[PDB]
Design a protein around this nucleic acid. Structure first.
Ligand SMILES: Nc1ncnc2c1ncn2[C@@H]1O[C@H](COP(=O)(O)OP(=O)(O)O)[C@@H](O)[C@H]1O
Ligand SMILES: [Mg+2]
Lengths: 87, 93, 520, 107, 98, 95, 86, 107, 93
DNA sequence: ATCGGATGTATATATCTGACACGTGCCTGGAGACTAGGGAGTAATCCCCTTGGCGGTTAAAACGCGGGGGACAGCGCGTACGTGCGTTTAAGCGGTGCTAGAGCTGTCTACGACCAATTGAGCGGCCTCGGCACCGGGATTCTCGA
DNA sequence: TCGAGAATCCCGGTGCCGAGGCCGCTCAATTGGTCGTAGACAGCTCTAGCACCGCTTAAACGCACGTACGCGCTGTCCCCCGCGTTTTAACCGCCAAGGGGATTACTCCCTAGTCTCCAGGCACGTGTCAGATATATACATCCGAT
């Protein structure tokens, strides 16, 4: 009965707890509560959904099927987070 | 002299969504400012869109994409529906 | 010898020894033009940039002792005796060396090429009194075999495998390599790419590569890394030159002798574009560089195989999914090949959520129907069967089907670790084993797998590269198969599988016409 | 050859000629398509009706006939899509939503 | 007794190490899988560019680092040194994102 | 006498239900003129201009006090403090 | 508009007015040091807005500051205001 | 006569002619004056020189002679004027300013 | 294939303040993005300024007012000085 | 738990003022020609992205344990806020006069657009050689347990 | 409160790759010459902003009294950190094929812009009433002390 997937733990879990700890260290925090990781994963998911929705709107207006760095940059600038370094 | 207002069109829409209500002068001024704000937002986004895609003309496709970028969710869906309906009715005439 | 003299000679005696050697290239062009006059085209093409090579060419042209040390009666220093064709191969290698040209040993797998190569190295060290250094690049799975062979036939040499963790590798480098306390080095592709710097700074007398077809994309990092090495001569060992292209053969040649075959455009314009009869006869351009033997005139006990193409037609859900894919998740032409294997490979094609392994498995796929009938028929005769597939998820499905019909299997895919790989091979190859089928991905296990006990191979899914399928057949056609191998390729009729088969047949025809024709 | 406004031809209430002229003289692009004013007018009229019905419902809730900026503010702030669309906007003579944190209420 | 650092003195060292560097702190393959799955709900059969995924990762990590700075400030304001989900929620509520 | 907090809660309900302006008009007008005299001398103002300035500034202060209240509650407190204001408008990005 | 200089007008933003603003914000207890902080933040905000509005009125070659100048200043600072034109 | 670039005529390094072309083709107004490209090029040059001087100082502080995004970020975030102008901008591969809150330090 | 950029001019400016300092390609791309963003901000504000006063022309007066609106404090004074100097030199030449 | 106050909260009546309906005219949107250029469709070349597999190295990640120090609760206390009451005061309102300056009209330059011809500035392609990354190894500093 | 000892910084040596520098060419800046229309300037006019002044009355202010809440201190768990040991997944290198998308020309047609007249639609100026304040007035409905 192994022809079924029964694999691939969630992709949000790929943001491991050490990675969140490293991000917290760059933010300058010393002690991290155990419940911080799930909250951080949810926050990141929401942010990514917003940005990716806008980028996909741009690329499908342009009549392509490839999301480009320019689409991502325009989406970010539209959200109000200008990004320098990708054109 | 002779400043345009949008007031009469806002009043026309009001007299069919709520046939027996009224509207104050300050509220009407607020409604006019809202209409102008949304107009300039959508038009600016459409202009930027056309510039990004290296086009010279602004078309209903640009307007639709600007609507999808600016409005949240259900508002965007219903606004797209109304715009498409109006454009088809206008073209088939 | 002593580590002091080896330190003096092994290391780069000069800062930049890579330059234009006039004597070597003059001798090379002289022998080449003596062999035939075809290579003038290559020389003219390469003369468009450097006038020194052109002046060498015209100096040689305007002016218009190969000791026959055939080395018959197999070398005394090599322990034991070896078969006559091995003597002939060693003689070919000696002739290559004394004529200052490289070559590709291209005997078929199992004939024995490591013995010939190490006997040639023993000739060098003993008849020419020249010890190492000698670099030997091999797939990681064969390093121990190389070391054992070297210690078996010519024991009195220094050979250490450069394998090990980073610290062990570093200490080995310092103790032996920079200490120059060795004769022959055994390394893997990944080791060569990784320990590039400590290995570049050696004046190599030879760079032997086993399974050289690996170096066939001349833009691969292994190719670039190997180019930076400095060596006197190079040698290539592989049983499958010209897998699926002429450009690959040119890349092998360009590595062998970068001055002769310096232009790929020349090699492509040679044959790629009677129209295809006289140009074929011009393959004498590759006559002196390639030596290949076939395991049919040398051995004998290996009856040949019979291959049958079993054509099947799509089932109802297969037709539905094929149409849904064709006119329109699904992001490649391979989705057509998934459907031709089993519709269950798409999620949702399997009926219903509470999945039950029942007859609908074989029912829903035509390949599986024919496979089931054939498997029952063979099980009547008791013949053991190997299943090959391009996809491992289909191997999962076949595993479920095989368990549902109570057959005994053993899987080897990329996921199964090496130890349990050996364990499963031993289980299947037990003299009284009760295992029936052997699920196996086509391109897995390298060449060490020896499933000689089986005598039936089915290629559930054909490949773009015909040589991969040929090796998969060879996993059962290997020397020692006293029975007769029977192969079955399942072809889905009127689908993309026919296109794949046609392309693979074109490539196989190309190989057979070019290299396998005059190999003698 | 009796005239017929494109606003009536499209079945709208907002003016299509005026929207066309504003687009044409607003330095948005060198050229303006024929259906862009119709699409924009339809969207503007939809949004106006959307906010206006909520404001009228609020005005009826407070037992009043006219709509005032307080009712406009209540509608916008109590509807989540409109509150996200008008997030950075101040409505003059509007106010705040009645809201007290529960920690402040007496035990 | 083997040598052992007291709690916090390695956290401070990590803070200095990671505020001195500039490289990305999330793994590229997991992040790419995440964005590829998220984009599946807006338009199936989408292709991506490597620079597009890189831009997404840079923006995401800058956002998360700024959020963690604000969260640390809230935690210190509450007379603590441990950051908590309530601190994250307060930081996102004041910024206007919730 | 009402116990402390009762009158404050009634005042919260009173002012969250009205829409008027909570600052006097002449003091604010004098303030904006005094501030403006540092950019250009002899400046005149429209009554509508001063009214718009008052509306914007009052909305700003009310929305700031909401965040300050949240910050004070976050620290297990009911009294708002200058540190709460500073934290609020440092997280907002106005620092 | 002749020979007029004003001072200490920030004290005209009285403590009761700050308290009413806090009540509309939903604040129950107010520290005694909050009023000076409030005066500072109000003065900073007003300075920025008035600077931009005066820049607009100077560009228009006028001497009167208009509600539309104030609206433009607020809109460019990101605080769009409805009800005074625009 | 002999052509002289307007950049050289104004004593600048930035391209006055290219700035003029972008102004004319950017849908900003119906007409563009003669002095607007000169003024805008001068302003752009000044800002570029300012940020580059700060970034070069940072690079020399780190004992390197080549400006990198880290040095650009260090220059921008350490100056209040440029930090205000570039408040909402994130510099790719820039990092952060080293900053630890004093409450977090030992003892 | 021709993509215009400000890299050459940024390098010319760099060799004037730091004659012995180089710059990598990533920093060059960041500088190009910075220049484009500042250009867009100033030009957009100038366009809005001309629209508010019912003018058809963008002039150095509009650019100066836009600079004063956008740049903060000490940056604006020096930017205005540089622009005025350049305009006077150009119009005298 | 009950009673005594204080605070909204409906309920009815009188005013007024601002919203709505009506009439003019003028300017702007619509109808109708005529035209040219923007954008759509076609075709060729080359490079990147997808899918489903393989092999290998090697750090990170996951897991378990111990123990320390930080969170959280509880208690006490002592100010500093809230509530309420007289007491000024200055904001709001109404009315008046004065004049600056905002807005409109008419003329007419001067300056931007546009076009044709010419040519230098800048972009792409190609090559190399220093700046910086990496690697021991050695001295220095800082933490910790005494 | 002085040694262990572990982490960090500072040196030299490699080595490699990307930043600068050079060359050709092409295409956008520059120069010279019409031309027409925006805006600059002068003059007028009338409106709304400013400066007063007087009067009333809420709102601000100063002070008292006294709770309750903010803050400091003390225990107590318990949860998070530091560290060692596995193990596993990221990360390179590969194979195959094919399409997506960017250029770079070309062709062409139909949809915009540009005019010219010319009616209606809309802005402005009026003239009414009804909906929304204002006052009283009685009711009910929390709050706080016995
Ligand atoms: N005495 C012998 N003479 C010749 N060949 C031998 C002798 N003993 C062993 N061999 C064979 O030599 C072979 C080595 O060559 P092979 O395995 O074919 O290497 P590769 O696969 O690299 O060609 C072994 O498989 C072994 O069977
Ligand atoms: Mg072998």
């Amino acid at each position: 009965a192994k022809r079924h997937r029964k694999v691939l733990r969630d992709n949000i879990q790929g943001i491991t707890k050490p990675a969140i700890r490293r991000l917290a260290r760059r933010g300058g925090v010393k002690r991290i509560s155990g419940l911080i990781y799930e909250e951080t994963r949810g926050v990141l998911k929401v942010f990514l959904e917003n940005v990716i929705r806008d980028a996909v709107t741009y690329t499908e207006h342009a009549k392509r099927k490839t999301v480009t760095a320019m689409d991502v940059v325009y989406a970010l600038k539209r959200q109000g987070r200008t990004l320098y370094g990708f054109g | 002299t002779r400043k345009e207002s949008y007031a009469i069109y806002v009043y026309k829409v009001l007299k069919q969504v709520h046939p027996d209500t009224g509207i104050s002068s300050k509220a009407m001024s607020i409604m006019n400012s809202f209409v102008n704000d949304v107009f300039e937002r959508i038009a600016g986004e459409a202009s930027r869109l056309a510039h990004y895609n290296k086009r010279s003309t602004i078309t209903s496709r640009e307007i639709q994409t600007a609507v999808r970028l600016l409005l949240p969710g259900e508002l965007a869906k219903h606004a797209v529906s109304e715009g498409t309906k109006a454009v088809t009715k206008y073209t088939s005439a | 010898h002593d580590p002091e003299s080896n330190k003096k000679r092994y290391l780069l005696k000069d800062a930049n020894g890579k330059k234009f050697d006039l004597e070597g290239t003059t001798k090379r062009f002289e022998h080449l033009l003596s062999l035939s006059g075809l290579f003038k085209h290559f020389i003219e093409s390469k003369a468009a940039k450097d006038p020194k090579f052109r002046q060498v060419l015209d100096v040689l042209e305007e002016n218009k002792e190969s000791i026959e040390f055939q080395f018959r009666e197999s070398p005394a220093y090599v322990n034991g005796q070896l078969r006559p064709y091995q003597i002939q191969g060693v003689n070919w290698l000696v002739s290559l060396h004394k004529n200052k040209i490289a070559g590709i040993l291209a005997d078929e797998m199992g004939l024995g090429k490591t013995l010939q190569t190490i006997s040639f190295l023993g000739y060098l060290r003993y008849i020419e009194k020249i010890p190492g250094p000698f670099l030997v690049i091999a797939p990681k799975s064969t390093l121990n075999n190389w070391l054992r062979e070297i210690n078996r036939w010519t024991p009195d040499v220094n050979a250490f495998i450069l394998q090990g963790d980073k610290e062990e590798r570093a200490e080995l480098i310092q103790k032996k390599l920079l200490g120059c306390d060795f004769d022959v080095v055994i390394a893997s592709y990944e080791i060569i790419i990784r320990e590039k710097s400590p290995l570049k700074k050696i004046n190599w007398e030879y760079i032997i590569i086993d399974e050289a077809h690996r170096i066939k994309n001349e833009e691969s990092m292994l190719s670039q890394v190997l180019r930076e090495f400095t060596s006197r001569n190079r040698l290539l060992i592989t049983g499958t030159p010209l897998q699926n292209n002429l450009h690959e053969l040119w890349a092998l040649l360009n590595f062998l002798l970068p001055d002769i075959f310096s232009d790929a455009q020349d090699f492509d314009d040679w044959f790629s574009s009677d129209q295809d009869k006289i140009v074929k006869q011009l393959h004498t351009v590759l006559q002196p560089f390639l030596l290949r033997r076939i395991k049919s005139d040398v051995e004998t006990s290996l009856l040949p195989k019979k291959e049958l193409n079993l054509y099947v037609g799509m089932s109802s859900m297969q037709k539905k999914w094929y149409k849904k894919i064709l006119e329109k998740l699904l992001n490649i032409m391979m989705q057509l090949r998934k459907c031709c294997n089993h519709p269950y490979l798409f999620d949702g094609a399997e009926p219903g959520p509470p999945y039950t392994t029942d007859e609908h498995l074989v029912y829903n796929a035509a390949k599986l129907q024919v496979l089931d009938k054939l498997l029952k028929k063979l099980k009547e005769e008791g013949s053991r069967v190997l299943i090959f597939s391009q996809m491992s998820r289909l191997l999962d499905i076949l595993e479920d089907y095989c368990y549902f019909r109570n057959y005994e299997y053993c899987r080897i895919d990329g996921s199964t670790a090496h130890e349990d790989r050996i364990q499963a091979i031993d289980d299947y190859n037990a003299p009284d084993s009760k295992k029936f089928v052997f699920l196996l991905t086509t391109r897995a296990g390298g060449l060490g797998i020896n499933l000689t006990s089986a005598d039936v191979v089915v290629l559930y899914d054909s490949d773009w590269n015909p040589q991969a399928d040929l090796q998969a057949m060879d996993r059962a056609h290997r020397i020692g198969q006293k029975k007769q191998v029977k192969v079955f390729r399942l072809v889905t009729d009127n689908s993309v599988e026919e296109k794949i088969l046609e392309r693979a047949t074109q490539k196989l025809r190309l190989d057979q016409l070019v290299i396998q024709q005059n190999r003698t | 050859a009796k005239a017929k406004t494109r606003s009536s031809r499209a079945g709208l209430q907002f003016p299509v000629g005026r929207v066309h002229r504003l687009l044409r003289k607003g330095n948005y692009a060198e050229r303006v398509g024929a259906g862009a004013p119709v699409y924009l007018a339809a969207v503007l009229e939809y949004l106006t009706a959307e906010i206006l019905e909520l404001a009228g419902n609020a005005a009826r809730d407070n037992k009043k006939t006219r709509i005032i900026p307080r009712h406009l503010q209540l509608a916008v702030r109590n509807d989540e899509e409109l509150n996200k669309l008008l997030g950075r906007v101040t409505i003059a003579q509007g106010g705040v939503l009645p809201n007290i944190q529960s920690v402040l209420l007496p035990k | 007794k083997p040598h052992r650092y007291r709690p916090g003195t390695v956290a401070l060292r990590e803070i200095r190490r990671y505020q001195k560097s500039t490289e990305l702190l999330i793994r590229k393959l997991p992040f790419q899988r995440l964005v590829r799955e998220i984009a599946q709900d807006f338009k199936t059969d989408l292709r991506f560019q490597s620079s597009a995924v890189m831009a997404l990762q840079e923006a995401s990590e800058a956002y998360l680092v700024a959020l963690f700075e604000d969260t640390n400030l809230c935690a210190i304001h509450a007379k603590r040194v441990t950051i908590m989900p309530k601190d994250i929620q307060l930081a996102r509520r004041i910024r206007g994102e919730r």
